[PDB]
Amino acid sequence: SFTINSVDMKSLPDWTVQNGKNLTLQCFADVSTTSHVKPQHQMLFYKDDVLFYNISSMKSTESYFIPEVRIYDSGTYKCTVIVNNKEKTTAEYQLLVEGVPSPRVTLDKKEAIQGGIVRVNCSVPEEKAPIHFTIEKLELNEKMVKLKREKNSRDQNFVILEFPVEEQDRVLSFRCQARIISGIHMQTSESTKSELVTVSR
């Protein structure tokens, strides 16, 4: 006496969003009935086939709010909705968070001395490891990149790169940009073997 016609998910503003913007996910259903009775709905939210939201409600649409959306939020989203029986599940929708928050650059000394070092802390606090960092040392007098040292944090939110003050330095500045692998796909063949070789001694 209940038939669920179609089931759908939507994300607002889009399924592609700028890092840090506000986001809302919706799992609605369309159910036809002859009954007079108010049905119970259960909405189940999956990211990459793992259940992150389980809600039972009288209305046929429910929502989930994602406050400041980061790259670690992108992935495959689908919702399953059940009524009394007859679940139906939505398709897979790719949420793509694009863009990296501008990195925070911090230093140990405001003023250094020749031969000393500067410890450069480049970070992206709002995000999650692993991040790849590129830090360039600029002497302002000549807009040449005096030194370029890239590093790939794996465990952490940031890097700390030590930069040397060479004897011909006056006013220094450090420039960091961070990049993060949004997605990677890697595949393996199966092993194959070869004609036996018979060492004969």
Ligand X SMILES: *[C@@H]1O[C@H](CO)[C@@H](O)[C@H](O)[C@H]1NC(C)=O
Residue numbers at the binding site for ligand X (CB under 6 A): 21-22, 51, 54, 56, 67, 104, 106, 121, 123, 125, 158
Q: Least distance in Å: CB of 139 to ligand X?
A: 23
**Residue 83 C-beta: closest distance to ligand X, Å:** 14
Question: Strand 104-107 and strand 117-123: pairing?
Answer: antiparallel
Output 68 or 166, the one with its CB closest to ligand X: 68
Q: Closest distance between ligand X and the C-beta of residue 159, in Å? A: 9
What gap in Å lies between CA 189 and CA 118, rounded to an integer? 47
Walk across the sheet containing 131-139 and list its strands: 145-152, 131-139, 172-180
**H helix or E strand, kind and range, residue 6:** strand 2-12
Q: With residue 175 as reference, give the H or E element that holds it.
A: strand 172-180
Nearer residue to ligand X within complex by CB, 54 or 182 = 54
CB of 9 or CB of 43, closer to ligand X: 43
**Of the two residues 40 and 141, which places its CB atom closer to ligand X in the complex?**
40
CA nearest neighbour of 78 among 99, 98, 53, 115: 53
Closest distance to ligand X from the beta carbon of 108 (Å) = 9
Q: Least separation, in Å, of the C-beta of 21 and ligand X? A: 5
Which pair of tokens denotes residue 138? 């600029």
CB of 126 to ligand X, least distance (A): 11
* Assigned token pair, 128: 């999650």
Ranges assigned E (strand) in 34-171: 41-47, 50-57, 61-66, 75-82, 88-89, 93-98, 104-107, 117-123, 131-139, 145-152, 158-164
Closer Cβ to ligand X, 28 or 45, answer by number: 45
Q: Which is nearer to ligand X, 24 or 114 (CB)?
A: 24
